[PDB]
Amino acid sequence: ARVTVQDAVEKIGNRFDLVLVAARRARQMQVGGKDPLVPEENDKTTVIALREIEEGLINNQILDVRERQEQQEQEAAELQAVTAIAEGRR
Amino acid sequence: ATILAEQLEAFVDLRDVRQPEVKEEKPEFDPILLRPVDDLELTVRSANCLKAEAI
Amino acid sequence: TPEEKLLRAIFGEKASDVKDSSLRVPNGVSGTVIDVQVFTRDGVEKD
Amino acid sequence: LGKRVDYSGRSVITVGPYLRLHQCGLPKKMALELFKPFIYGKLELRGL
Amino acid sequence: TLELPLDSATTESLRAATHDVLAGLTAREAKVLRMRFGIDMNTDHTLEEVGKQFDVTRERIRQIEAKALRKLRHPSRSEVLRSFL
């Protein structure tokens, strides 16, 4: 099947939870660049192509979870505020 | 049968030191070369001499 | 048009009055031709 | 009730012993058509 | 009247990048056209443009513009003027 996928649903007593754990955060990593990701480059997927590795994926960040934190409206309020992101050419 | 013989000459201990396949394929190009000469910032003089010489 | 001459001035200034607006081959697979018919205003009863 | 998808494909169905339980085969040319906006995003980053 | 997503990214990159490479050109001829309608309003004043740069007369009012036109051929990857028509 896939790598470390059935291990994330057995470690915690829920499946629908793991979804947003690697959803509202994963899609947020791209719209925020890549700097917000402070963990080491160890927890990262591997893509075999041209004798090198690219992309990034996820499902390898879920380790230190918690109950109550932030609401749900600020997730994309101060995120797109600190970093605007765009696309320019020479 | 001769073809099969050559397909085993590596086991008869023969002086044949040749490399198998050392090919490296990774299709790449330089689309930037397809850009006109108006991307190097030139003067009107050269911008009229080159274009006059099929450039 | 004046503003148009600017674009072609970069990729060889050669803008002719008439162009080639022929019927191009639709997407898919091409094929040979069978027959060709030309009716340049025949003296017959054509509508 | 029915919204047409902007990105979809369709063709004849065949078999593939090489495939796995969690794998599926697909046409070659169809790959370029489907992931069109995506393939251009990687070609720019590369050298192609 | 409504551009599709296909050319939506093309038309955007064809009207906001020329004023970047425009600076890299002879100050005199470039500043005449740029600092006239691009920063202000209305172009071609003749007896007013002659006192805007404080130099020549009303002759180069047509020359400078023409000399600049052929210089607009420079912006290849970048474009702005080639869209109005």
d(CA A39, CA C40): 78
Q: CA of B48, closest CA in chain E: separation in Å?
A: 10
Using an 8 Å Cβ cutoff, are C10 and B36 in contact? yes
Fold of A1-79: Eukaryotic RPB6 RNA polymerase subunit (3.90.940)
Question: For the stretch C24-38, what's the b/e string if a residue is b when 16 or more beta carbons lie within 10 angstroms of its beta carbon?
Answer: eeeeeeeeeeeeeee
Beta carbon pairs, A and D, within 8 Å:
3
Q: CA of C24, closest CA in chain E: separation in Å?
A: 23
Radius of gyration of chain A (CA): 15
- Contacts (Cβ under 8 Å, ≥6 apart) of E39: none
Query: Which ranges of A1-90 does DSSP label H, i.e. alpha helix?
Result: 8-11, 16-21, 26-31, 79-82
Chain E residues within 8 A of C6 when measuring between CB atoms? 69, 72-73, 81-82
d(CA B55, CA D5): 47
User: What resolution in angstrom units was achieved for this structure?
Assistant: 19.8
| Interface of chain E toward chain C, CB-CB under 8 angstroms | 69-70, 72-73, 76, 81-82, 84-85
Task: Count the helices and strands in chain E (H runs, E runs).
Answer: 4, 0
Chain B residues within 8 A of E70 when measuring between CB atoms? 44
Cross-chain residue pair B38–C10, CB shorter than 8 Å: yes
Q: Output the six-digit token pair for C31.
A: 């094929």
Between the CA of residue D37 and those of B32, C7, D31, D32, E5, what are the distances in Å?
21, 27, 11, 9, 10
Locate tokens 């499902």: which residue? Answer: A59
d(CA C11, CA B48): 13
Amino acid at site A39: P
How many other CB atoms are found less than 10 A from the CB of residue E72?
Answer: 20
Q: CA of B3, closest CA in chain E: separation in Å?
A: 57
- Using CA coordinates, name the residue in chain B closest to D43: B28
d(CA E23, CA E5): 31
Angle among Cα D40, D41, D42 to the nearest 5 degrees reads 90
What phi and psi values does residue C8 have, to the nearest 5 degrees?
-75, -10
Residues in C 1-47 with any Cβ partner in B closer than 8 A: 10-11
Distance of CA E17 to the CA centre of its chain: 12
DSSP code for E34: I
d(CA D43, CA D32): 12
d(CA A8, CA A23): 14
Using an 8 Å Cβ cutoff, are E75 and B37 in contact? no
Q: CA of E1, closest CA in chain A: separation in Å?
A: 25
Using an 8 Å Cβ cutoff, are E85 and C4 in contact? yes
Nearest to D40 by CA among E78, D48, B35, E14: D48
Locate tokens 């109550």: which residue? Answer: A68
Residues in chain A: 90
